[model samples]
Target chain A: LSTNHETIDLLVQILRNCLRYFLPPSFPISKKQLSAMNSDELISFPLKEYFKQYEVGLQNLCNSYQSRADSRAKASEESLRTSERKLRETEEKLQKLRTNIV
Target chain B: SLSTNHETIDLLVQILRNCLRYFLPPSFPISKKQLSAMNSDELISFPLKEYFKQYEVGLQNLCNSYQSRADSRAKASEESLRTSERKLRETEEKLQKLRTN
Candidate 1:
């Protein structure tokens, strides 16, 4: 009833793929090996771990938001007009951030 | 070496834990139905999509730069560095939007 379901699915898939980019790869370092490394070495180690954590958390949140939007669209036909309203409100908030440099 | 190793391990563990937390839900339960409905345009308006896309591109570029810089620091490769960087930027951008609004 909304836009093409295929289009919606494609967009969702893109988001999912993008989200997957945030997940961290399995490191080969063992606990014992990690224990063996010195502080400087550890600090110097290739660690995007913090970034990965943030990425996963954000993607999950985005996914939840997406679900909400889908629900709203479905509810639009019924008396639940609030769903679309909420979606618009959420988008506006997102738009503000996208436009702002900070 | 002992102290340094301890610190390094701690750092790694902390980072790893932080990442794990991101994958796991941080707040109250949300319905899958609700999330599926939220389109990219709805979550981020069409006009903003351009910026987000550019931001992602910028992140990838930055990661490339970092990779070049880090080459001397460690033998580690940049494998998914670009994607990871983009993801981080997107999340930050989203959070900033959410907070202000």
Candidate 2:
């Protein structure tokens, strides 16, 4: 009776909440096609949209992750370079001082 | 009567399989258990949360590595500065002794 409906409701919630990366903000469905869709097609509409957008969505996700990682990497790399420069200058000064002492 | 929405169920499960492929490890543990055994709330929450936790851990490791390297370099610079100061003082002492002689 209510068995499959509950499962379908749960699946809908899962797709809406968990697998949101595959879903985009806007999907332009053809009006004619939308009008022609039967029950299964209507239900599969969002899933098809998700499948169609999957590759591009993954790419966007990768770009976002890379952007974040690049920001941190660049910041740390700059600090690391500054530290290296300071160490080099300090070592050079120590060498000069040792030479004077000798 | 026959069941309805089975096709939609198939489609959703297929999409879920693809989604999990990216977020989950190649050796996925959830495969060992049937999805039906778990509560719907846990199903929606745990996997995504676990993925985010792993991501945070990985990012933290990257930042920590950079910070540790920079800190060690700064420490080395301070050590060298101290050695330079000592050398300067010793040079001054030697000059003073030679002048007294």
Candidate 3:
């Protein structure tokens, strides 16, 4: 049956694609146990859960991108408002001087 | 039988690793101008697109993987950028006030 070869092909693809993230030097957790648990905990993975995790990661990544954008926007707008206020107050003071002279 | 590979598992791990990156403090590596421009959006989405394509061809056919883009899942990505653009534009509204006054 055709089911024979397709099975082998699928297995091969799974092995090649079931990705893992090696602990980067910058790993943020339990850094001391890094060596002991390096390959033991995540040596193999389930396809269903793994796929969901991948999607979740991508979503998080996108969310961070948006958050950073919003953060800067907040800073920029606040700075603009403060600076504008300062400029206007100074302008009024200068105007006061001119009127007093007149 | 559930089957998979070293590299594939590694890639998935990398995804989780990046996911966990949110736990740490933000670097704000992308600058204000770039964030408004949606440059950072493209940076994250492009590699993500490539990863999804691999997922699609490699294992997605077996299951209903949400693999597509801005290539199957374009809406959210585009919408995120669109929101950033709108926020950036709102900031510009202050520009008019700052100038006229």
Candidate 4:
């Protein structure tokens, strides 16, 4: 409490502005994290590195999205093969066993 | 919590100190209210990072300018010969002008 409230207010303003400088308006992670914290927390935040890390966080977010898409593609491809085999089995004289669906 | 290294803290402080000489420090700005609120993830990339460098460089230039001025004064102390030389040149120029007249 030694510091006056106005200084605290000024610090909050700078920190808030600094956050805006590096991020887009709707960057979801920033929105979530920044919203979660109070002004006091914002002041102490090591902002410069945070932005670089945000760039990395975004990379990881994008990577996960890409990986999930790849998995879905691979799964779809496998399902098509299974569906083809199942179709052939339905018409065969003897029934074929199913292992994994896809 | 996001915490910058001590080095960065020092530089920020230096910029504030320099700006304070001109009575314009708070305008540069920010601080932590809670001691534990610091973070390192986006720690290096915070927005307006450019201004950090800008002010840091500015403080350095200020220091350098002040140092240069002091050095110039110190160098001038050894100028007894140069002072005489300059005076001679000024008087010589005056003589030529007078002779021409």
Candidate 5:
């Protein structure tokens, strides 16, 4: 019985990272409850849904950062073009004015 | 017997290697020979699992902050570009007037 319990406990420890996505919102799972459960019962808990939600969570994370990066790149590109155009237009205008002055 | 305790240690070692490798690279080195010397009770009381809960929350927060910080940087850069463009236009106008004279 102790061995079974220890194995279950260790298994719970392994999945601790993923359990929060599915576990009930009430409170932490108690050892007595875990002890009452069988290995098959605990093992069969809905991991597929966890995987689906977790992947979506990761996608949202990447989307957030990617949006920021894209904004930065877009602004940066616009700044470069605007500056170049301004410099070129000003130089052309200055050249025509100098030609007129001379 | 298949040495159940050894099996548990093996599982733990694998979890530590795969999950916690980013944080505790050289500090928490483990060996089969070392684990072979310890009993199951010692293994159960070990602090291997504690860090998972602590760091999981922390890492999530860190990731969120990273996203927000990147957003802040993007906004700042955009504003800087706006101000820089305004200044450049002003300077160009001043230069044109000076050249006209």
Candidate 6:
């Protein structure tokens, strides 16, 4: 889990740097300007579409981890009961043997 | 399992928007003269901190769910063994009674 978080953090940092490089110094450009930019302007855009792909991938990984965790928890509960019943049966057998000998 | 709750996803989207808004160039470019008068808090509160908290909770919950499922599986296997053993003992007892008669 820690590793996954680190990877996601790294991706976010890359995205930030990419955006910072392409954008103007004024900060907070209007949506209209962004939309008007040509394909060539966008082609050189840093991070660009890469950030969206990274986010989607990260979310998918999280979902996979959750499913595996659920299966492991169920396996532990079944073990305890079997041990108790075996112990009880053994004791009963020992008592029967002692009575027959006496 | 792959999906996030609506609230968490919304927070993530907001954070992305904040990041985009912060980097884009302002046409008027809030002047150096006016920079001192404006506060950083006014321009952006990305909610990254809030998102971090939610992410932590989600991780802990996943861990707990995993533990619970593991425990249940262990219990089921043990129960199966006990049931089989008990049946064996009953069979043996019945055979012994028939032999004595």
- Across A1-102, the per-residue lDDT of candidate 2 in tens digits comes to 457566666666655554443344344554344444443554555655555665565455455544644555555556556655655665566556657767
A1-102 in candidate 6: lDDT tens per residue?
A: 544344334434533444443343333444355555433343344343445544554455555655554454444344435545655666566567657757
TM-score of chain A of 1: 0.27
Candidate 3 C-alpha lDDT tens digits along A5-48: 44333433332332333223232433344333333243443434
lDDT of 5 at A81: 77
Prediction 5 global C-alpha lDDT: 0.56
Chain B TM-score of candidate 6 stands at 0.52
Across B1-101, the per-residue lDDT of candidate 1 in tens digits comes to 45543443444444333333333332313233433444334432323244345556655555555444444322222223334445555655676666766
- How far residue B29's Cα lies from its native spot in candidate 5, in Å, is 13
Which candidate gets the maximum lDDT versus the true structure? Answer: 5
Clashing pairs in 5: none
Q: List runs of model 4 lying over 4 Å from the truth.
A: A1-3, A24-28, A32-36, A43-49, A54-102, B1-101
What is the C-alpha lDDT profile of model 4 across A1-102, one tens digit per residue?
A: 323333334444444554554454435547557545545465455544655665665455445535544454555445555554544444331211222211
The Cα local distance difference test for each model comes to 0.44, 0.54, 0.42, 0.44, 0.56, 0.47
Task: Evaluate every candidate with DockQ and list the scores.
Answer: 0.05, 0.13, 0.04, 0.01, 0.18, 0.07
Error of 1 at A18 (Å): 15
The clash tally of candidate 2 reads 0
Stronger candidate by TM-score (5 vs 6): 5
For model 1, report DockQ: 0.05
TM-score, chain B, each candidate: 0.26, 0.54, 0.31, 0.35, 0.44, 0.52
Interface Cα RMSD, each model: 31.5, 8.0, 15.1, 39.2, 4.9, 13.7
lDDT of 6 by residue, B30-88 (tens): 43334333323332333434434554565567556656665566556656666666665
Off by over 4 Å in 2: A21-102, B26-28, B31-47, B55-101
lDDT of 5 by residue, B1-101 (tens): 34554554455444433333334323344544454554445455556655555556665775777777777777777776777677678768866686759
TM-score of each: 0.20, 0.37, 0.29, 0.24, 0.50, 0.35
